[PDB]
């Protein structure tokens, strides 16, 4: 009965723990010891973007490192231009409570979603010249927390139902559903080759998926609170994860372990966003103490502080060419650092 | 270089045409209030898909009223998106024990880190069953709460004519039970407003109107150091 199944699960857990312990002999710190330090770094807010009424939950960059899109709870989806500080489009929304935003890689479509349980696709290339709804996707039973484009016809969505979904915009139906989590899944990120993706949830675990087969391959547990944001290492063989216990972690796919933890005593808030730079040497982290930190990914030392915001930091992003960093907060502003 | 000038001119025109309507929407947005309904005859109160939305006006003042629908029961993460709402209308029935669960929910929503500015309008529903049932001798209040045996009715109670002393004792005990948590924590930023309500009635919208008036007046008096 249930007791026998629990005993079998315990036996497999012990076997996996032993298999992980066998493969580990030396820590990453014992290797990255004699390498030169990165030194102090400084960044100045050489931009400021104004015009929202309420706070900001989500922003997303573009392919050309020029245009970004931002979502606000006054019911507005704004497309900006980082160079000349101009607004190109300002989409109204039928639902005021939005929580996520996404920009398609072809530059033709934008996505939106929130507490209405529906993912909406907005078209930007219209003969009439008006930006209207092109498709509404409604098959979820909980709020949408993150969505990302694959092509102009496929989308991946994440909800508070403990599920993830793969859609098909042309037809309007779900193709595959991923169900392994026990608590709300908060964020997800796509691998460079569009074959796999990792997700983090409110049960203090990260999971690895496959897009075609639809099965889960790896589960990682090293935290003590809820997972909030996640992102791949640019190589595609590691990823960094952030939680609400004032620590960040680095995980590897080849060894099924955690290599390094980032935490300092004067840090007692949570962590709301994470991102990697181009070369994998720096790790950015946004905090609830109204501050942004830059860590060295190979020594775990506080490489710099960015302090210019007056409220909680929610969204953070880095361009594809590694030029600038963009930060949003609950004061209805976006800043472009460098 | 003419093409660059044309592009810059087009972009500036688009920006201006957008900003005008942004300002109009600002003006329309600022003059509307927002309320979160949470909890219990919700249909009774409202009469008198994740979100159900209701719009109404009293004395040419406009309100938005938001009720959560198709959602789970984990409130940890979607309760933050109501940081700036002017009032949480909390409906609780006064009659497992539901009341102690309501107490724990109130304590959690009161002490949260992002909700230390929001105020709570409390509704204590089911007055008829609160009065009729207790006269039969069913000790619903003496056993669940063992502090009730030595509670004395306060000096300011003003019951409606014909009320039994036991009924008013029970009502004021419940109200004081809710009002113990509110005073201990909030240091002048946010308050709690109690209101007895009936299943058949027509005066709840006026109560919400007056309470919103009071909260906004209190905030303005607070910024100038008068209060």
């Amino acid at each position, epitope marked *: 009965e249930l007791d026998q199944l629990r005993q079998e699960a315990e036996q497999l857990k012990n076997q996996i723990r032993d298999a992980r312990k066998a493969c580990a002999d030396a820590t990453l710190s014992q290797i990255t010891n004699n390498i030169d330090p990165v030194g102090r770094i400084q960044m100045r807010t050489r931009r400021t973007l104004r015009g929202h009424l309420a706070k900001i939950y989500a922003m997303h960059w573009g392919t050309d490192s020029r245009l970004l899109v931002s979502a606000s709870q006054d019911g507005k989806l704004i497309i900006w231009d980082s160079y000349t500080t101009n607004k190109v489009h300002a989409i109204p929304l039928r639902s005021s409570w939005v929580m996520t935003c996404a920009y398609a890689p072809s530059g033709n479509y934008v996505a939106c979603g929130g507490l209405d349980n529906i993912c909406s696709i907005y078209n930007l290339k219209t003969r009439e010249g008006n930006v209207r709804v092109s498709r509404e996707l409604a098959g979820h039973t909980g709020y949408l927390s993150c969505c990302r484009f694959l092509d102009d016809n496929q989308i991946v969505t994440s909800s508070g139902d403990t599920t993830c979904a793969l859609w098909d915009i042309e037809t309007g139906q779900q193709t595959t559903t991923f169900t392994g989590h*026990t*608590g709300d899944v908060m964020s997800l990120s796509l691998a460079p080759d569009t074959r796999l993706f990792v997700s983090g949830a*409110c*049960d*203090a675990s990260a999971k690895l998926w496959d897009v075609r087969e639809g099965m889960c391959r790896q589960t990682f*547990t090293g935290h*003590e*609170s*809820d997972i909030n944001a996640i992102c791949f290492f640019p190589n595609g063989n590691a990823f960094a994860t952030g939680s*609400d*216990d*004032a620590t960040c972690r680095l995980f590897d796919l080849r060894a099924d372990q955690e290599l390094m933890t980032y935490s300092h005593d004067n840090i*007692i808030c*949570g962590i709301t966003s994470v991102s990697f730079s181009k070369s994998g040497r720096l790790l950015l982290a946004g905090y609830d103490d109204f501050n942004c930190n830059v860590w060295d990914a190979l020594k775990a030392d506080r490489a710099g502080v960015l302090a210019g915001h007056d409220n909680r930091v929610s969204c953070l992003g880095v361009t594809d060419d590694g030029m600038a960093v963009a930060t949003g907060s609950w004061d209805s502003f976006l800043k472009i650092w460098n | 270089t003419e093409d660059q000038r044309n592009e810059e001119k087009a972009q500036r025109e688009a920006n201006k045409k957008i900003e005008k309507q942004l300002q109009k929407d600002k003006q329309v947005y600022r003059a509307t209030h927002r309320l979160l309904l949470l909890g219990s005859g919700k249909n009774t109160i409202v009469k008198q898909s994740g979100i159900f939305e209701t719009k109404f006006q009293v004395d040419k003042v406009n309100f938005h009223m938001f009720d959560v629908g198709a959602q789970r*029961d*984990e*409130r*940890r993460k979607w*309760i933050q998106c109501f940081n700036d709402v002017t009032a949480i209308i909390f409906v609780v029935a006064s009659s*497992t*024990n539901r009341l*102690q*669960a309501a107490l*724990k929910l109130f*304590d*959690s929503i*009161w*002490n*949260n*880190k992002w909700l230390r500015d929001t105020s709570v309008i409390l509704f204590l529903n089911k007055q008829d069953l609160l009065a009729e049932k207790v006269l039969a001798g069913k000790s619903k209040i003496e*056993d*669940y*709460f*063992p*502090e009730f045996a030595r509670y004395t009715t306060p000096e300011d109670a003003t019951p409606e004519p014909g009320e039994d002393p036991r009924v008013t004792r029970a009502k004021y005990f419940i109200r004081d039970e809710f009002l113990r948590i509110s005073t201990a924590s909030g240091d002048g930023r946010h308050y709690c407003y109690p209101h007895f309500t009936c299943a058949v009635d027509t005066e709840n919208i006026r109560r919400v109107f007056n309470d919103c008036r009071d909260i906004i007046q209190r905030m303005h008096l607070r910024q100038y150091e008068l209060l």
Partner: nanobody
Amino acid sequence: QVQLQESGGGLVQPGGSLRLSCAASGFTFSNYKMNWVRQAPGKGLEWVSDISQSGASISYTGSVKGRFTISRDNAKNTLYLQMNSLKPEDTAVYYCARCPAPFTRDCFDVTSTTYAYRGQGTQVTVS
């Protein structure tokens, strides 16, 4: 990994006494606030009692006030519940729950189905 094990329990004669233990591993026991919950046959989940970080703020539900006691040990990472003078109404499964975040003053969902940081529980019976 966040693992919580419960020890003690079983059948106890009415008007008796019992002791229950909760051992936790996978997190810093001294940064979190802890509580107990129960779940009866045919009924939902219900709150019992709790303890703060240091051990100063102790609360109770009211239907067990003065009869049960709760205690906390940090050097051994173990939380205790002592039960006295039982009754036929006190038969249910008992769970040892932890609030979702450190250094906090409140926690929302410890009495909701499908919550992460909750143990398997123990069975106590009074007859």
